[PDB]
């Protein structure tokens, strides 16, 4: 029951960013705060899951292997991101049909030849593609903010604006998602392939005047 919390992603002009805390929880217990939850798949894609890490790990191994073997064994071009995503989605669905569900929601990103790809898949095989995507509490807390940033920049976001807004959301998830930590990694998919950032933290604000002891006291 090691589980991973929110993932969020957004397309910028040029690429995709995906971000996640580096934390696996076990119920309420914050168990491992140094888990690299984002995982590269092939040369152009990365994936990250909310939910059962064990499911995630088994699913991500299945897909990584499929990719690597298809390519090593046949003189063929690596699978595109949509193709990998397709595979993963059908894999996840087949498992829901066997009553053996892969109990994660996943976000998937990838870039090939400046075509970008960002999708979400969920335990039952729902899948969807959008300019931003989130799972877990990301979907409740960050999507509205990310969506708002894409309404305001309908020409696409820059990498910096995108990373500014991603970061704004991480901070909000940090404040409002219980099972979270202020340590994040962000994968960036672009032309070149995908890089995962070193873990980083966001600045938090806790000193609003209304948070003071006198004001929040229940009894005067």
């Amino acid at each position: 029951m090691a589980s991973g919390g929110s993932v969020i992603a957004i397309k910028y002009k040029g690429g995709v960013l995906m971000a996640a805390d580096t934390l696996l929880s076990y119920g309420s217990l914050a168990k491992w705060p140094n888990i690299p939850r984002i995982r590269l798949l092939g040369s152009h894609s990365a994936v990250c899951a909310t939910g059962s890490y064990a499911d995630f790990q088994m699913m991500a191994k299945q897909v990584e292997d499929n990719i690597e073997r298809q390519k090593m064994y046949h003189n063929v071009d690596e699978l595109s991101p949509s193709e990998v995503f397709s595979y993963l989605h059908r894999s996840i669905y087949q498992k829901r049909c066997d009553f053996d569900p892969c109990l994660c929601q996943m976000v998937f990103i990838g870039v090939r030849d400046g075509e970008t790809f960002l999708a979400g898949v969920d335990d039952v095989g729902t899948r969807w593609e959008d300019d931003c995507i989130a799972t877990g509490y990301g979907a409740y807390i960050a999507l509205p903010l990310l969506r708002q940033a894409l309404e305001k920049n309908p020409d696409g976001l820059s990498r910096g604006e995108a990373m500014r807004i991603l970061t704004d959301c991480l901070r909000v998830l940090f404040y409002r998602e219980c099972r979270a930590i202020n340590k994040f990694q962000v994968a960036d998919a672009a032309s070149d392939g995908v890089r995962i950032s070193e873990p980083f933290d966001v600045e938090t604000h806790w000193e609003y005047e209304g948070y003071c002891f006198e004001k929040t006291a229940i009894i005067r």
Binding site: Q70, Y73, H74, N75, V76, D77, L79, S80, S82, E83, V84, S86, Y87, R90
Partner: protein
């Protein structure tokens, strides 16, 4: 020949006669040619030509998915088995990855299917040769396959009866095919296919199929409207 009755029997010179005999099935099917340009692959198959006013279709050429299809020679019923197999493997692949099965992987497969039928008692070699033409991210492809399980990646080829002459023809012209247009690829195929006709028979819309496949061109068997254009 004490050694030619079973697919599981090597001969003392290291031959497998049942496989050489399955090859004969292919050398005795109706001729088919394929050629590969920069962007396109053309299959042309001789059919069987009217017995007076008295026709006769057999399906030689098969579409297999949008991006690939094939021409067979030899035991047509084996053709159909292989066609069913390829079709099915291509749909599974397209179901899973939402894109066409790449040709080098499909050639690997069709060759593994053949091998599965040349090593155990009571299976037998497919008595059918395939030209498989298809187009993917790596460009156009043309494979010939044979009962033995071998798969050749060709630039041009022919097989079936009198197809040695089709191969003589193709050997003169094949180095140009990478520059030719679709119309000259088709011309070149038809020319080659005709070097394989018996004496004074000639090519026409009712003893010749043409399929093409290539860039932005799903695999397409040509019917009597579009074929006529190319056959004159």
């Amino acid at each position: 020949n004490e050694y030619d009755s079973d697919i599981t029997t090597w001969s003392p010179t290291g031959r497998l006669f049942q496989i050489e005999y399955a090859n004969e099935a292919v050398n005795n099917g109706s001729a088919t040619v394929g050629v590969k340009g920069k962007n396109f692959v053309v299959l042309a198959a001789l059919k069987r030509s009217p017995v007076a006013e008295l026709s006769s279709y057999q399906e030689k050429v098969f579409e297999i998915d949008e991006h690939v299809g094939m021409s067979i020679s030899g035991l047509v019923a084996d053709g159909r088995v292989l066609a069913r197999y390829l079709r099915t493997e291509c749909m599974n692949y397209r179901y899973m990855y939402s894109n066409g099965m790449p040709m080098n992987q499909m050639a690997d497969m069709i060759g593994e299917k053949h091998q599965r039928h040349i090593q155990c008692s009571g299976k037998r070699p497919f008595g059918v040769g395939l030209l498989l033409a298809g187009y993917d991210r790596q460009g156009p492809h043309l494979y010939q396959t044979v009962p033995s399980g071998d798969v050749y990646d060709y630039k041009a080829t022919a097989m079936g009866v009198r197809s040695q002459a089709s191969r003589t023809y193709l050997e003169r012209h094949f180095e140009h095919f990478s520059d030719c247009t679709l119309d000259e690829l088709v011309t070149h195929a038809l020319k080659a296919l005709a070097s394989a006709t018996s004496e004074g028979i000639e090519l026409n819309v009712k003893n010749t199929t043409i399929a093409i496949v290539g860039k932005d061109t799903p695999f397409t068997i040509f019917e009597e409207e579009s074929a006529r254009k190319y056959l004159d």
